[PDB]
Design a protein around this ligand. Structure first.
Ligand SMILES: *[C@@H]1O[C@H](CO)[C@@H](O[C@@H]2O[C@H](CO)[C@@H](O[C@@H]3O[C@H](CO)[C@@H](O)[C@H](O)[C@@H]3O)[C@H](O)[C@H]2NC(C)=O)[C@H](O)[C@H]1NC(C)=O
Lengths: 216, 192, 228, 155, 219, 213
């Protein structure tokens, strides 16, 4: 397309400090583009916080966000920035910078967005599950106590890509994260080959492989 | 097909109190020159985007231009108040137009002050949107009957600007042209 | 990349009138004005006129109100100029060009000017009539330089009009050739000569020939060179 | 806080007292940028002037034309407001865009005491009009020559 | 500020038919001179930034086919999708831009509809090192069901528990729109050792009666 | 209106240098209503600089313009052996007036002309006229002086001078000076002398001939 919008990468902080995020545009005719910012809670809709112009730094704010978020622009590298003075526990969400030519215009072009959270670090652990009496039996492994997201799960290094279901990670009571992955397999090949759950964690940069057999 | 060069690439621009009307229609108008001229510093547009108006087409491409001190180029916006914004040229509300401005310090200034561009300073009332008032008669401040003489309460309304090559970064005079795209329900709607 | 084309050179008699044309292509002919500019041979240019292309209202020069008429046609995208009351002193070159100084819609000064020109057109007028050339040899004299060179030339006089196609041994000689610009004289006729210098060894060892063809009078002449 | 301007114009001291005790502005302005001291000097309500300057009103304020309260107060011919403004420390050589010095209005309206009271603290006689003229020629122009010799001798 | 609303929040329609969504405003959004509505219709698949579908409430953005349409006037409008594809599952949003600021709707969820499916339920206790860590996590797993609605309950030696089961649901399945759900129960090592028989009970339209799977600890 | 003279009329410079043409008027003028045009020999004019600072389509970057008030300057920066032409500064602030043109020429060393003088044969006897010629070759620069003397007497209104343009291979010229007269006046005067004085000549060179020789 004729306009390219890019943003910063994913990055999270402890509460209390500030926050620096940026949005850049590139292409032909960018000088007629306003930059607006949109927020999404996990599992909810969109909200508007602010809009700005790159050249003369004209700002407009949402009725419910003045003072907590700072909007800035810089015409030299021709980008826009968002500042957070203080961080709360309720500021863990996915944010989009988006472009619209003029005021009262459709918000057509978008970036990819970046997410922010608050928690305390820990590496995961993985446990197996295999049933016993048939027809088809369901194998799986679960993983507990990891943060941030995500963990790449794998089935025989991707050799089996049917009947796979990885459960979308959901936070538990104490705020940590748990996940589980399962497949169904015919009861014929139960004791012929091994089943292995592979899990890779970038934040902990850890590779774990778990061996699954039925219980004697 | 519309002579956008004459309105944009002209030589003599009149002062703000003598702003120049430029009515324009009966063409096919190309906006790609306005898209990426790489020289306008304050391309700002309200209501209607210029990237997408190519499809639609009406009459009433009423557009005008002048030259103005740099700082107050922000003051030309609907619902915005100011000295020249209120007092020489004021947009209506519910805007649909498109403002363009750019720097011309390199040519429209001469050392020692180019005293050619003037602007009104006061007026009893406040003007209606999109109306022009030109008048050089004196202002009578108080209870003294003043006919044609200048005195302690008789003051010249029009005042001259000061333009210097080494003026402040906003003190150079910018050129401003604003377009205004509207429509009317009457037939014979020439497109563009 | 736009194309401008003009007609050919013309010859007239005093008291007549001359019409010329300019054809434009490769751009919207209804968006720019036409400019006509002349130049006398060996002298600087001088502005004939400018003409719009939509309203028909134009702007002539101050000094040429009662002699020139300007017309444009949008159908063929052409511009014609008719010059009346021509005198023998008006022999010159003309040029048509696209204007960027007076806007073709409302007529105000802008930035820029005559961007693309034509190929130029040549106009002549005189009381004389077409006449064949008068050829004349100039072989080196009896005192031709021994320790040096000699000069060979063929001279043409009373030829009407310009040009003359002159060659020496049908293009055999290509280096050291000088053809001279046409120069008027009190009789009002034409004069010209062509010269090459040769070493003293070529004096009596080879004979040379000047061929001259004058297409307007379609006259072909050939003359040998005899040392004396 | 536009009430104080019309209150000072009307010369109702109780209303200005209660309003400014309630938190009225000390520099409330109209679109023309006029000051309450200007109105008080125009109407010659000395009590309002002294009350307002007690809290520190804009003694060197200027309007759109740059008019200063000393200029208007000299124009009307009020004897004590000008000198209290002077003793507070307002500018005496102040000139608007038209370049009118207080001595110029003083000579124009034929009021003499203001001339000397300005001269007491160092009023300047180097005023330059369109022709660069000073107060001497205007003083002789006003039809009262008895002013002119005083500025001639007060130098 | 102008307020919006959408209906339905979620929808169930088979493949290859018409689907509808209705968006109502709080005040008039018509602009005086230009007689075109200042509304916008957006599509957003999971893990994707939004892609504009309809602008000016009646005009189609480049790059999408005709099978989407929008109509309405005043303060009520409706977007209709005809002859849907399996790819057409996403979240659709209505938002106006009449003046600063703009307010979106709550959201719309589309979902393909088909026959009821027989689900599968399994129960698992954890392994020894999990117990030696200090925690015990017992899992009920329920799979490949349709419709989504299926109650899940626990039972500790034929006795109830409160605030112990965490429920997780997956998204739409590409094969036959059958989903998977998990219920996880965490407890202390001793408390796990404090009881013998754990039972899991499930309720679903695919079952004539709730189905319970129970097992005794260590056997 | 406005007078305009560039000056000097000849700006002969050696190749590989900088050229700074100066254009001047009498009254003041806008900085946005003047242009610079180029004219190759035997070729149509072209646009070079407009607006006194900008450039047109496909213009080499060696060309620039500056100036203000009543004085303007065109800078060529790099002089190539293609850029030799007649240049014109033109105004359009009030009406429009063109300049006087300027000629840029290739410098070289001094030149020694060679001279050949020839009287007519009986091919002019067949007519009622007579015409003698003097020819000079390889001189430098355009200025020169030639003269005639019929029995040590110069006559006016009977001679014509012709010069060619700059030579493409050596950059020099050849001049012809022809004297015409009635045939009757040819044979009643005996001595005819053709003389030449020029800076390229150390001394004035004279050749005298007779009717019979
Ligand atoms: C007013 O004057 C300016 C100054 O020249 C004009 O701008 C010129 O507009 C033309 C439009 O075609 C530009 O040509 C384009 O150039 C680019 C880059 O070389 C090329 O990729 C395109 O295909 C096209 O040929 C030209 O560059 C541009 N010149 C400058 C200095 O910006 C303008 O058109 C005039 N009129 C108006 C209404 O502004």
């Amino acid at each position: 397309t004729q306009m390219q919008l890019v943003q910063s990468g994913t990055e999270v902080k402890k509460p209390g400090e500030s926050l620096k995020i940026s949005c850049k545009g590139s292409g032909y005719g960018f000088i007629t583009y306003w930059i607006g910012w949109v927020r999404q809670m996990p599992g909810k809709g969109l909200e508007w916080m602010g809009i700005i112009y790159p050249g003369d730094s004209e700002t407009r704010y949402s009725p419910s966000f003045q003072g907590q978020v700072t909007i800035s622009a810089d015409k030299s590298i021709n980008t826009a920035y968002l500042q957070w003075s203080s961080l709360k526990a309720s500021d863990t969400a996915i944010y989009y910078c988006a472009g619209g030519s003029g005021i009262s215009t459709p918000m057509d072009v978008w970036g990819q967005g970046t997410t922010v959270t608050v928690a305390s670090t820990k590496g995961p652990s993985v446990f197996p599950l295999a049933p016993s009496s048939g027809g088809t039996a369901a194998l799986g492994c679960l993983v507990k106590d990891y943060f941030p997201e995500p963990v790449t799960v794998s089935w025989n290094s991707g050799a089996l890509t049917s009947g796979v279901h990885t459960f979308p990670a959901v936070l538990q009571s104490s705020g940590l994260y748990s996940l589980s992955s399962v497949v169904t397999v015919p009861s014929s090949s139960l004791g012929t080959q091994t089943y292995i759950c592979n899990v890779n964690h970038k934040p902990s940069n850890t590779k774990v492989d778990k061996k699954v057999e039925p219980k004697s | 097909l519309c002579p956008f060069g004459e309105v944009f690439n002209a030589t003599r621009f009149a002062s703000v109190y003598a702003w120049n009307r430029k009515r324009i229609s009966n063409c096919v108008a190309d906006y790609s020159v306005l898209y990426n001229s790489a020289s306008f510093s304050t391309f700002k547009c309200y209501g209607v985007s210029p990237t997408k108006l190519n499809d639609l087409c009406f009459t009433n491409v009423y557009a005008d231009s002048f030259v103005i001190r740099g700082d107050e180029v922000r003051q030309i916006a609907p619902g915005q108040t100011g000295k020249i914004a209120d007092y020489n040229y004021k947009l209506p509300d519910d805007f649909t137009g498109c403002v363009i401005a750019w720097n011309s310090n390199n040519l429209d200034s001469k050392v020692g002050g180019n005293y050619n561009y003037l602007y009104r300073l006061f007026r009893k009332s406040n003007l209606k949107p999109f109306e022009r008032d030109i008048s050089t008669e004196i202002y009578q401040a108080g209870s003294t009957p003043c006919n044609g003489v200048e005195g302690f309460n008789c003051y010249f309304p029009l005042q001259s600007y000061g333009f210097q090559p080494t003026n402040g970064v906003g003190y150079q005079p910018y050129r401003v042209v604003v377009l205004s795209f509207e429509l009317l329900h009457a037939p014979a709607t020439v497109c563009g | 990349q736009v194309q401008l084309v003009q007609s050919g050179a013309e010859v007239k008699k005093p008291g007549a009138s001359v019409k010329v044309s300019c054809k434009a292509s490769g751009y919207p002919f209804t968006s720019y004005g036409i400019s006509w500019v002349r130049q006398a041979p060996g002298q600087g240019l001088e502005w004939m006129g400018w003409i719009s292309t939509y309203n028909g209202n134009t702007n002539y020069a101050q000094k040429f109100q009662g002699r020139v008429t300007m017309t444009t046609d949008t159908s063929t995208t052409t511009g014609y100029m008719e010059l009346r009351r021509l005198r023998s002193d008006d022999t010159a070159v003309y040029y048509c060009a696209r204007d960027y100084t007076r806007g073709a819609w409302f007529g105000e000064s802008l930035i820029g000017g005559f961007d693309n020109w034509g190929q130029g057109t040549l106009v002549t007028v005189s009381s004389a009539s077409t006449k064949g050339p008068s050829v004349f040899p100039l072989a080196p004299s009896s005192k031709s330089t021994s320790g040096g060179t000699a000069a060979l030339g063929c001279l043409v006089k009373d030829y009407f009009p310009e040009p003359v196609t002159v060659s020496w041994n049908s293009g055999a000689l290509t280096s050291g050739v000088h053809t001279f610009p046409a120069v008027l004289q009190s009789s009002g006729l034409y004069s010209l000569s062509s010269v090459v210098t040769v070493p003293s060894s070529s004096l009596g060892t080879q004979t040379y020939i000047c061929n001259v063809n004058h297409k307007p009078s379609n006259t072909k002449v050939d003359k040998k060179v005899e040392p004396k | 806080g536009k009430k104080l301007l019309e209150a000072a114009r009307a010369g109702q001291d109780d209303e200005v007292r209660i309003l400014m005790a309630n938190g009225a502005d000390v520099n409330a302005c109209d679109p023309s940028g006029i000051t309450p001291l200007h109105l008080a000097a125009d109407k010659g309500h000395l009590e309002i002037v002294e009350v307002l300057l007690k809290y520190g009103a804009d003694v060197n304020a200027m309007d759109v034309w740059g008019r200063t309260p000393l200029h208007l107060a000299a124009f009307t011919g009020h004897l004590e407001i000008v000198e209290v403004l002077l003793k507070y420390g307002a500018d005496v050589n102040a000139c608007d865009l038209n370049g009118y010095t207080p001595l110029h209005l003083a000579a124009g309206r034929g009021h003499l005491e203001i001339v000397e009271v300005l001269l007491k603290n160092g009023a300047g006689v180097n005023a330059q009009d369109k022709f660069g003229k000073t107060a001497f020629d205007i003083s002789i122009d006003n039809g009262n020559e008895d002013l002119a010799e005083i500025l001639q001798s007060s130098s | 500020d102008i307020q919006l609303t959408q209906s339905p929040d979620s929808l169930a329609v088979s493949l290859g038919e018409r689907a509808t969504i209705n968006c109502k405003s709080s005040q008039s959004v018509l602009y005086s001179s230009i007689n075109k509505n200042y509304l916008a219709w957006y599509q957003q698949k999971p893990g994707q930034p939004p892609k504009l579908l309809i602008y000016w409430a009646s005009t189609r953005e480049s790059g999408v086919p005709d099978r989407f349409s929008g109509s309405g006037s005043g303060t009520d409008f409706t977007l209709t999708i005809s002859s849907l594809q399996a790819e057409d599952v996403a979240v659709y949003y209505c938002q106006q831009y009449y003046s600063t600021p703009y307010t979106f709707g709550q959201g719309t969820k589309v979902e393909i509809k088909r026959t009821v499916a027989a689900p599968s339920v399994f129960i698992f206790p954890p392994s020894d090192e999990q117990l030696k860590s200090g925690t015990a996590s017992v899992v009920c797993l329920l799979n490949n069901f349709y419709p989504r609605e299926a109650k899940v309950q626990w039972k500790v030696d034929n006795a109830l528990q409160s605030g112990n089961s965490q429920e997780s649901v997956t998204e739409q399945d590409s094969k036959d729109s059958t989903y998977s759900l998990s219920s996880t129960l965490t407890l202390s090592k001793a408390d796990y050792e404090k009881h013998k028989v754990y039972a899991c009970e499930v309720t679903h339209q695919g079952l004539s009666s709730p189905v319970t799977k129970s097992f005794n600890r260590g056997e």
